[PDB]
Design a protein around this ligand. Structure first.
Ligand code: NA
Length: 129
């Protein structure tokens, strides 16, 4: 599913991401934009042979099982395929664990490089939330 910007903002808000670990909703929408362009089915292979899955490009090195990432963990206790669903519940629940891991949203290199310190409120501008 390719979410609309406000559509994804509403879904993230409903699932309690708005101000989760102190990160405003626009931070999450901005991260999703640059990770996946709001496409739940986004997959990208990392140099280390792990894969990033779904709207927030959650990595098989630590967070989900894809069966092809040697020596990896599955800390969200989910198949990586669950992160590609039209229903973002598994992505949001796993994102809550990631952002609680100690580096906050710096875990998402695209958030650090493209969203951090920017006017992230612009990402929820116009949305009926
Ligand atoms: Na894994």
């Amino acid at each position: 599913k390719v979410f609309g910007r406000c559509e994804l903002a509403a879904a993230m808000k409903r699932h309690g991401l708005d101000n989760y670990r102190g990160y405003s909703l626009g931070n999450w929408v901005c991260a999703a934009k640059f990770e996946s362009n709001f496409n739940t089915q986004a997959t990208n292979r990392n140099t280390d042979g792990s894969t990033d899955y779904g709207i927030l490009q959650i990595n098989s090195r630590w967070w989900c099982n894809d069966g092809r990432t040697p020596g990896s963990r599955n800390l969200c206790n989910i198949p990586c395929s669950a992160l590609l669903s039209s229903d973002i519940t598994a992505s949001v629940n796993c994102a809550k664990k990631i952002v609680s891991d100690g580096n906050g949203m710096n875990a998402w290199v695209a958030w650090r490089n493209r969203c951090k310190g920017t006017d992230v409120q612009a990402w929820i501008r116009g949305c009926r939330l």
